[PDB]
């Protein structure tokens, strides 16, 4: 028994776009199919619920003409539908079986939704497309309780931005972490270095950001006042 | 809808408990591992399925259920979450203690003068050297919380297997220069530390 | 007495005759046994026992019955399934179903329940031992029941969980209300006629009725969500001939227009199969008037989920389990053995 969902696919505010979930190891026609999505840091959203076998479904209120559940019993095959793309709407959509529920004999006997059988899970992207080199900003050191600075990557797409510092010669302490994706639809990203406070007015620090899809090379010193 | 703690933590041989808070109804619980889907594990409360491990275990008491896991495993380390129907639980992170617990340094970075002649305001908190790889990360503009423009990333390993995280703060230097007062708050195994920043 | 719930074969009875070439007939001169003359009920006093509809095997063996009805009956010119095609001769038939009787062998009983406003679920006071059921008319039909039984007493509202939304509501009415369809003698086209005064009197009731169980909320209708034609619009059969009809109007929130409300229907000849499988080709229909009255009896209905957090519980007209068609039947039986 399994279900086997789509790869991620990337999209642009308005628009719309399908998901499809395909069973296999067991009857499909029997058992109803749940969809569910998860924004990144949050917890799951129900999405509503779809019977494969008449195609009957029911969603939330927050939900009914965003989002729509279809079926192919002769592939046994799931489908959502995410209409009217937003930024809200890049998520995680999971679809699963509820063996308690459906037609035919072997309900499970559960009176919870009893949420079995998951799909791994597809990413929905929405990306308000178009290209944008970045700006990149110094996030500079201030106020034994040592030294952070670093740099702040602002307003960029696509994936990705390749940031190093002093050209590569720096590596002690150095952490660049992964871009985040803003209500803009642009990513944004900073980086992050470690030093002890003796080194201010004496060793130099330099943001080097590479943006090769819109030919952006940015050097930016990062001083302390 | 159901609470659920964020993060939750024990060392090998031990036990633990998750618990959710919002309901009466029936709680069935699953356990997401890193690079699998979900699988159910206690249902209606306290009932195991056939092919579930006898320290997983479901208990209730008013308006709490929770799940409890008895002689930790590492293959343990996961996800968890709770449902009664389409009322689910926020999901807690269950980390199985690798290391000695570490607190995190928080630092916290105004707006640079260049985005402000730009007339944007990035306030950007990086929470670093921390373990377990769970936080919570939360706004406060003078003493009121912050739900618009907080965009937070996934603790990541840091280059000493230890965890890092960042947050930011969009705004128009409107808004910054009109509250006198902005903090980061993060919450680690219990304990917050908050650093504050001024348009000054 | 000794007896303890049990699964058996049971067989059907009827009062077909043997020289009839209407199909329900035809079916159950071979199929069935004739019913029993003079029978007999036994009450068995200060006995309760508890029944549980959404659990009773009868619900199933009479489902298999009827799809086998069917599959003997139904003659479609083309059936075409996962990649196969099998064309046909496809005469009209004589299409009117006949009262049919679920009755035990030796070595058990059924058990009938007569406490009236048994919901189908509790346990029950007034228990009765008899051998066969009463006669259930097996009438396939999305929506809308028809030709069924009466509630007794008050409208009865029966689910598995109200609170769970995942499972299917059935109402069963206090008082039926006939809806009359008619293809008259482009010609696919039918409608149906409602008495809208009676019609909305009842709905009336039947959501003061939802409006108990779901703590005095504000009840409101709305057309089906999503799926397939067959549960969209209420669906049946007249005659041999598939008709659907747009039953939105049926569900006027505005008006709990008391003139006839008529709804739209069509006569189709490709339906899918309600074995799940693939569709079906049917022969244009008869020429002159197709008429069917019927009594409407109940009505299956779904509750959306969400709206914890609100004032207003809606539901939406659906069948599409034709089983919950045969427990709204059987609520009151229990086969046992001694
Ligand atoms: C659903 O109905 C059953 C009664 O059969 C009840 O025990 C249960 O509490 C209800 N649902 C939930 C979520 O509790
Ligand atoms: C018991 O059932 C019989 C059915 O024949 C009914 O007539 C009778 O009134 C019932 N008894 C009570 C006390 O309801
Ligand atoms: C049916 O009645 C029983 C008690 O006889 C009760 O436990 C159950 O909740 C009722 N179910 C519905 C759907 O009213
Ligand atoms: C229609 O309803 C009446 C009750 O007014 C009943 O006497 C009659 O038997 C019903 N017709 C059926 C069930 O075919
Ligand atoms: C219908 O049921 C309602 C309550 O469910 C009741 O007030 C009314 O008397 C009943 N009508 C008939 C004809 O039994
Ligand atoms: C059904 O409708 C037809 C045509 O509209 C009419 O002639 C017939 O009298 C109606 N039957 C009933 C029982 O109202
Ligand atoms: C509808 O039913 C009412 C009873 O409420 C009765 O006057 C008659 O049978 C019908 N009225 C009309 C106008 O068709
Ligand atoms: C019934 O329910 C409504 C809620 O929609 C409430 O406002 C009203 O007061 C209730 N009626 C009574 C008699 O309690
Ligand atoms: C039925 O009619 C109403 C309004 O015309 C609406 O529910 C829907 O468009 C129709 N249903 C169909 C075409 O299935
Ligand atoms: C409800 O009833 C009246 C018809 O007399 C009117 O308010 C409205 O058109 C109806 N709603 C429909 C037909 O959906
Ligand atoms: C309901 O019973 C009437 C009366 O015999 C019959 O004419 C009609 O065809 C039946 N309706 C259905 C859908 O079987």
């Known amino acids: 028994a399994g279900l086997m969902q789509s790869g991620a696919v990337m999209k642009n505010s308005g628009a719309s776009v399908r998901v499809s979930c395909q069973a296999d190891g067991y009857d499909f026609i029997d058992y109803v199919i749940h969809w569910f999505r998860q924004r990144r840091g949050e917890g799951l959203e129900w999405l509503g619920w779809?019977?494969?076998?008449?195609?009957?479904?029911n969603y939330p209120r927050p939900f009914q003409g965003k989002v729509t559940m279809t079926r192919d019993t002769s592939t046994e095959t799931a489908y959502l539908d995410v209409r009217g793309l937003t930024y809200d709407d890049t998520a995680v959509y999971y679809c699963?079986?509820?063996?308690?529920?459906?037609?035919?004999?072997?309900?499970?006997?559960?009176?919870?939704?009893?949420?079995?059988?998951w799909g791994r899970g597809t990413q929905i992207t929405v990306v308000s497309a178009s290209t944008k080199g970045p700006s990149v900003f110094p996030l500079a050191p201030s106020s034994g309780g040592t030294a952070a600075l670093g740099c702040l990557v602002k307003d960029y797409f696509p994936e990705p931005v390749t940031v190093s510092w002093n050209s590569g010669a720096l590596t002690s302490g150095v952490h660049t972490f992964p871009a985040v994706l803003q209500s803009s639809g642009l990513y944004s990203l900073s980086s992050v270095v470690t030093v002890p406070s003796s080194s201010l007015g004496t060793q130099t620090y330099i943001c080097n950001v590479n943006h090769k899809p819109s030919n952006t090379k940015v050097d930016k010193r990062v001083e302390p006042k | 809808a159901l609470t659920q703690p964020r993060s939750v933590s024990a060392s090998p041989g031990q036990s633990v408990t998750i618990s959710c808070t919002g309901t009466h109804n029936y709680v069935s619980w699953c356990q997401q591992k890193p690079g699998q889907a979900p699988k159910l594990l206690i249902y209606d409360f306290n009932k195991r399925p056939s092919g579930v491990s006898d320290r997983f275990s479901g208990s209730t008491s008013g308006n709490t259920a929770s799940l409890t896991i008895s002689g930790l495993q590492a293959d343990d380390e996961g996800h968890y979450f709770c449902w009664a129907f389409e009322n689910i639980g926020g999901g807690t992170k269950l980390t199985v203690l690798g290391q000695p617990k570490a607190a995190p340094s928080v630092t916290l970075f105004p707006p640079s003068s260049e985005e402000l002649q730009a007339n944007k305001a990035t306030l950007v908190c990086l929470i670093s050297d921390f373990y377990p790889g769970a936080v919570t990360v939360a706004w406060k503009a003078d003493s009121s919380p912050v739900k618009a423009g907080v965009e937070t990333t996934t603790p990541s390993k840091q280059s000493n297997n230890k965890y890092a995280a960042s947050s930011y703060l969009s705004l128009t230097p409107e808004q910054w220069k009109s509250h006198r007062s902005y903090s980061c708050q993060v919450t680690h195994e219990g304990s917050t530390v908050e650093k504050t920043v001024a348009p000054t | 007495p000794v007896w303890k719930d049990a699964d058996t074969t049971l067989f059907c009875a009827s009062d077909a005759k043997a020289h009839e070439t209407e199909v329900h007939n035809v079916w159950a001169t071979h199929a069935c046994v004739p019913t029993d003359p003079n029978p007999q009920e036994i009450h068995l006093e200060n006995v309760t026992e508890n029944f549980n509809m959404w659990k009773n095997n009868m619900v199933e063996q009479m489902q298999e019955d009827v799809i086998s009805l069917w599959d003997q009956s139904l003659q479609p010119c083309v059936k075409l399934t996962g990649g196969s095609v099998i064309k046909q001769a496809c005469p009209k038939i004589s299409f009117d179903p006949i009262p049919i009787h679920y009755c035990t062998p030796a070595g058990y009983v059924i058990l009938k329940c007569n406490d009236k406003n048994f919901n189908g679920t509790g346990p029950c006071k007034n228990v009765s031992s008899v051998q066969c059921t009463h006669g259930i008319k097996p009438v396939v039909s999305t929506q809308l029941l028809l030709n069924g039984s009466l509630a007794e007493e008050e409208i009865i509202i029966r689910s598995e969980n109200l609170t769970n939304n995942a499972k299917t509501i059935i109402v069963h009415l206090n008082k039926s209300v006939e809806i009359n369809c008619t293809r008259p003698s482009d010609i696919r086209k039918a409608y149906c006629e409602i008495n809208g005064t009676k019609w909305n009197k009842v709905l009336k009731q039947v959501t003061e009725k939802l409006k108990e169980h779901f703590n005095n909320k504000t009840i409101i209708f709305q057309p089906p969500s999503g799926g397939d034609l067959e549960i969209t619009m209420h669906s049946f059969n007249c005659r041999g001939e598939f008709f659907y009809c747009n039953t939105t109007q049926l569900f006027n929130n505005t008006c709990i227009c008391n003139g006839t409300i008529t709804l739209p229907c069509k006569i189709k000849q490709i339906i899918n199969m309600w074995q799940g499988t693939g569709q079906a080709m049917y022969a244009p229909p008869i020429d002159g008037k197709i008429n069917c009255v019927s009594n409407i009896t109940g009505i299956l209905l779904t509750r959306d989920g969400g709206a914890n957090n609100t004032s207003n519980e809606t539901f939406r007209p659906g069948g599409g389990n034709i089983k919950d068609n045969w427990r709204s039947e059987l609520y009151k039986y229990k086969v046992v053995q001694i």
């Open positions: 699963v079986r509820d063996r308690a529920n459906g037609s035919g004999r072997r309900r499970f006997e559960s009176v919870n939704w009893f949420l079995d059988l």
């Open positions: 779809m019977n494969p076998s008449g195609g009957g479904t």
